[PDB]
């Protein structure tokens, strides 16, 4: 299907401790492939997926410079924002940036994104037309006007529609054996009595990729979107994901409940029953 | 590949 490439950046100011913490991660779909961390020992952008190691020294030099340049921009911006907002020097503040692009199943550009937050709240974002900005507040309006005057949207668009796409497509080819493949959920049901009259049924999905999945409980073939305990999808730690859903049922009525699992790794949706 | 353009706020 479609694919995305996303870069996530977090800068945290650290008064007295000296320099800000800077961490950048890059993803293709739900697979991390690089990282840059100011507190890591390396000082370079480094690989987090085997297929990005196909890239040569020039790629690594270039992407390392980009990470060092971005780091310095956010460090400047942390000082700048403290100034715009008239904040004191003693507290710690955070900038987050996410950017990237989506392509279709045949590599066609679908869209691009660029959004910035300060202290966990929207600051400025490139709109979908990639030709204009939305500023969340009056400080971001200072940023918006100066960015409009220098035609910053054109520069971002050139990136999002150009190298972002070129990069993503190349990663999809080089890493096709993992990125363009799926891992289906491994499933099972557990049963745990609560009392003499009720029992918990928990339907598990393990070892799946990508992260997107739908777990649904039915009773006599009817959706049970009320008495359902449902956890956030979570990383297994090996590049795959886990999720469960549970229902409290009357003891003896277990066979009436079915768990339905939908995942692109499955040729057909799965139905589980105790 | 990342975006090489840096803009101040």
């Amino acid at each position, epitope marked *: 299907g479609s694919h995305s490439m996303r870069y996530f950046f977090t800068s945290v100011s650290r008064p007295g401790r000296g320099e800000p913490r800077f961490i950048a991660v890059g993803y293709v779909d739900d697979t991390q492939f690089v990282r840059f961390d100011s507190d890591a020992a390396s000082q370079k952008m480094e690989p987090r997926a085997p297929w990005i190691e196909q890239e040569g020294p020039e790629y690594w030099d270039q992407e390392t*410079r980009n990470m060092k*340049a971005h780091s310095q921009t956010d460090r*400047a911006n942390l*000082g*700048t924002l403290r100034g715009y907002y008239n904040q004191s020097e003693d507290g710690s503040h955070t900038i987050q940036i996410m950017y990237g692009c989506d392509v279709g199943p045949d590599g066609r550009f679908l869209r691009g994104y660029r959004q910035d937050a300060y202290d966990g709240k929207d600051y400025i974002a490139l709109n979908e037309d990639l030709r204009s900005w939305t500023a969340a507040d009056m400080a971001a309006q200072i940023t918006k006007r100066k960015w409009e005057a220098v035609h910053a949207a054109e520069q971002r668009r050139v990136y999002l529609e150009g190298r972002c796409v070129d990069g993503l497509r190349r990663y999809l080819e080089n890493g096709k054996e993992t990125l363009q493949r799926t891992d289906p959920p491994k499933t099972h049901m557990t049963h745990h009595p609560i009392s003499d009259h009720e029992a918990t049924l928990r339907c598990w999905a393990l070892g799946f990729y990508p992260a997107e999945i739908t777990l649904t409980w039915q009773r006599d073939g009817e959706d049970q979107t009320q008495d359902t305990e449902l956890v956030e999808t979570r990383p297994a730690g090996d590049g795959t994901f886990q999720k469960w859903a549970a229902v409290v049922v009357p003891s003896g009525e277990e066979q009436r409940y079915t768990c339905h699992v939908q995942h692109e790794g499955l040729p057909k949706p799965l139905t589980l029953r105790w | 590949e990342a975006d090489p*353009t840096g803009h*101040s706020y």
Partner: antibody
Amino acid sequence: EVQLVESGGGLVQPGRSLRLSCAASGFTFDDYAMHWVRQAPGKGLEWVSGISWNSGSIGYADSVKGRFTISRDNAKNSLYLQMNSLRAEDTAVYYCARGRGFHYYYYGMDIWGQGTTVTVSS
Amino acid sequence: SYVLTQPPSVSVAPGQTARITCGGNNIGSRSVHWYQQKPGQAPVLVVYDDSDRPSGIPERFSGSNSGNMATLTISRVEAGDEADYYCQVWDSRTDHWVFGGGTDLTVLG
């Protein structure tokens, strides 16, 4: 080791143009922001313009906007200042200076050249 | 226009700690740099980001910055330190680098 060698300075009639050049050596030129800073006779320093490492961002002092243009050739390790519509008050020693980081904003000037003199005179 | 104010002259005795001040509205929220320009010479960066020293600059050059005042401090001042010193900040609201007017440091005697 590190050198920033300015050239192109001279006498220019007001209203005309002059191009200053700065030859950079002994460092990775394209890793750093670069700037022009000037000093009129007997006066203090005035930033003129800056350019980030890859030309991705550029700035100018209000005193020169619309008239001066900063540019760089990272293949030739050179920085330029095209000065148009010169005025008597542009008369100064123009210093080529290295920004201590990738960006023209925020990061101070850690290496300065010896300067080249621009005399805007009738 | 953002303004930085330096006294035009500071006079000192050798061995004292000279102090050159740089006033600015909420200058504490900015990152101060100081330059030393001796007679017949281009400027030299002596302190960056309020308090840091480039490699090669003596430990006796130090800086502070908070509120509406930044200070360059030169301990064990010697005759060689005579120069014009300029403070500087990047101002994002105006998109300008600003310099103070410069302080002429004379070492008397």
